[PDB]
């Protein structure tokens, strides 16, 4: 439904307004039951995650509990590890920039709460290098915490020993990928690996590893504190909890606000954030989960609850839940065209289908914006699109195909007219 | 992506970490597991850039030696990521975000403003080498859509004029109040908090027993 209470919200420091430093955090009481929780043990913590129903919170929303659980298997003499991706690259995502900058601590105890759940020896946080200032904030926060003894040996009074590190990203969206974050951490080129050697099995430095969206790590301590039920109650069925929503582009007050997941879209922009610029009638389309997810036109925008289940019914992905809105004042053919330009300037090129395919769609898309290309070419891009969708080593090729598919699926008449417009003036 | 040796950009340019920098390099290596120094390539290479913006081929070679990694590896990392200059770069090095979110909120205007403000075209640098204009991609901070990254700072939610003001500040004086030069605080609802209006909660609240 929606309408989460501020009291039941998780990052009270969102929008700042409270010292992102420890003191403000102590008034927040973020480090309240940390020793106790870890004392409970890895299993109990992971269990709470399952009860929570917390899905990914990052890109694909895999059940968090089960995922983390995959490394709750006995150590084989290799130190297990925690990797917390804070790349936050998906266009439209400033979701994570908040927790890191505004509430660094929540993530610090998220790390150790999560750490004992997987029995990780240590956690490395890959904040995108672009955010240099952001990094300045977290290690100040990390430094505070150890000074306190909250982390490190004798973590918060626990025999558990966990060390948290921050790693510099270098302006790559793909670094974000789970197998590629690792390789950047490993120091090689940021090129994803194949899934058959799964991340838990082969870890960073060949030591079991797990990767979580910073939001996913951050909520785990509060969910254990509030209990899985409290959390699980807010969401709809499988889709559960309240996910932060970042609305950017063609909305009166673009902002990141956390609301009950499964909150109707027409409502999200209506209640928080602000009205669609030019009236709700001025809504050509919206991309619910960021650039990777397909945009949905106004057919569903009227009544589509923003929960991953509802979106997959709608053929779109909740993803990072970044709402980008396009008024009737925008050349979508060019809007999506720059996202394909966003992906040609960024895919690693390791795999044949993404390398040439994304460049191929970029060339066709640029011609489509001009209208130089004939109408028959439009359904070809479709066929080029699905060749890329199922054949890619990572998901980015998955992601490049979806916006192209959305433009053809709902805005096929407009592209034909741009086709027609150029043919007429000759 | 080919380094054709040039008198300026080639190893004749000797590179070596200042004593202090080497100390920093050591810590960086400590974070990673022992026996995995190679993992510190990115961090160390960055430090080199901090030392010299150009990050010449010589620098890349030094990084390799310092981390005992094959020279090619350093090259791969440098030529793969984008935050590494691999050429001389302007003192200010402004970068304008032009992904759809920003563009939808009129990013193009900002770029145009800069082009003439700077007098230099994108992909190029000012004669004094004070400013280098680059059309970079999503830099995060999308909510404050109109946004650009001057050097390390993130100037956000900027209207064309604001930048001119900022650029002037950069041109005469320094530290031009880096951040969103708008009424909004960070990424709050511009008009008024849609939530988080009430005071934050307290320790232990609604906590399940133990």
């Amino acid at each position: 439904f929606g309408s989460l209470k501020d009291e039941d919200r998780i990052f009270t420091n969102l929008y700042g307004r409270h010292d992102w430093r420890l003191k403000g955090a102590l008034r927040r009481g973020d480090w309240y039951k940390t020793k106790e929780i870890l004392l409970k043990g890895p299993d109990w913590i992971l269990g709470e995650m399952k009860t929570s129903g917390l899905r990914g919170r990052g890109g694909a929303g895999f059940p968090t509990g089960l995922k983390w659980s995959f490394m709750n298997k006995p150590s084989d003499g290799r130190p297990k590890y925690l990797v917390v991706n804070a790349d936050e690259g998906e266009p439209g995502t400033c979701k994570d920039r908040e927790i890191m900058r505004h509430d660094p601590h929540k993530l610090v105890e998220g790390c150790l709460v999560g750490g004992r759940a997987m029995g990780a020896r240590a956690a490395y946080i890959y904040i995108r290098g672009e955010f240099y200032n952001e990094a300045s904030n977290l290690q100040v926060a990390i430094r505070e915490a150890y000074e306190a003894g909250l982390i490190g040996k004798n973590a918060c009074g626990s025999d558990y020993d966990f060390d948290v590190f921050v790693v510099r990203g270098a302006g790559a969206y793909i670094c974000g990928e789970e197998t590629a974050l690792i390789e950047s951490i490993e120091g090689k080129q940021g090129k994803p690996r194949l899934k058959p050697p799964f991340p838990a099995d082969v870890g960073v430095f060949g030591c079991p590893t797990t990767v979580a969206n910073v939001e996913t790590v951050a909520v785990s301590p509060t969910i254990c504190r509030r209990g899985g039920t409290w959390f699980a109650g807010f969401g709809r069925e499988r889709n559960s909890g309240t996910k932060l929503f970042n609305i950017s582009g063609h909305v009166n007050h673009p902002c990141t606000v956390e609301e009950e997941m499964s909150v109707p879209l027409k409502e999200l922009i209506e209640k928080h954030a602000g009205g669609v610029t030019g009236g709700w009638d001025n809504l050509l389309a919206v991309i619910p989960g960021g650039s990777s997810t397909p945009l949905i036109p106004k057919s569903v925008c009227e009544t589509v609850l923003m929960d991953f289940d509802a979106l997959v019914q709608a053929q779109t992905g909740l993803g990072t839940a970044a709402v980008i809105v396009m008024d009737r004042s925008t050349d979508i053919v060019k809007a999506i065209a720059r996202l394909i330009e966003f992906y040609k300037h960024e895919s690693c090129g390791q795999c044949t289908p993404c390398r040439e395919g994304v460049d191929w769609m970029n060339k066709v898309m640029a011609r489509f914006v001009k209208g130089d290309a004939r109408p028959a070419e439009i359904d070809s891009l479709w066929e080029i699109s699905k060749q890329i969708e199922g054949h890619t080593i990572c998901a980015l090729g998955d992601g490049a195909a979806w916006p192209v598919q959305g433009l053809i699926r709902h805005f096929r008449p407009e592209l034909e007219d741009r086709m027609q417009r150029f043919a007429q003036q000759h | 992506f080919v380094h054709r040796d040039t008198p300026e950009n080639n190893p004749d340019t000797p590179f070596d970490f200042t004593p202090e920098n080497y100390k920093r390099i050591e810590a960086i290596v400590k974070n990673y597991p022992e026996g995995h120094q190679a993992a510190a390539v990115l961090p160390v290479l960055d430090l080199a850039q901090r030392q010299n913006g150009w990050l010449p081929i010589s620098a890349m070679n030094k990084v390799a030696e310092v981390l005992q990694v094959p020279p090619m590896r350093v090259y791969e990392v440098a030529t793969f990521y984008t935050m590494y200059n691999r050429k001389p770069v302007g003192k200010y090095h402004i970068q304008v975000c032009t992904t759809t979110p920003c563009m939808l909120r009129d990013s193009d205007s900002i770029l145009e403003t800069l082009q003439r403000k700077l007098g230099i075209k994108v992909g190029e640098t000012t004669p004094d080498k004070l400013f280098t204009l680059i059309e970079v991609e999503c830099l995060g901070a999308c909510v404050n859509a109109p946004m650009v990254q001057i050097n390390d700072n993130y100037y956000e939610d900027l209207t064309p004029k604001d930048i001119e003001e900022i650029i002037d500040e950069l041109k005469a004086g320094k530290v031009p109040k880096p951040g969103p030069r708008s009424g909004r605080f960070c990424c709050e609802p511009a008009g008024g908090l849609t939530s988080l209006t009430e005071p934050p909660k307290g320790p232990g609240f609604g906590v399940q027993a133990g």
Binding site: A135, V140, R143, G152, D163 | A27, E34, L47
Partner: peptide, 22 residues
């Protein structure tokens, strides 16, 4: 306001806290 070495130098300061290596 932060310096170019804030991240690295701060980290070095944290080195002492950093738990022993693997």
């Amino acid at each position: 306001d932060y310096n170019t070495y804030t991240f690295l130098d701060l980290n070095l300061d944290l080195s002492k806290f950093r738990l022993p290596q693997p």
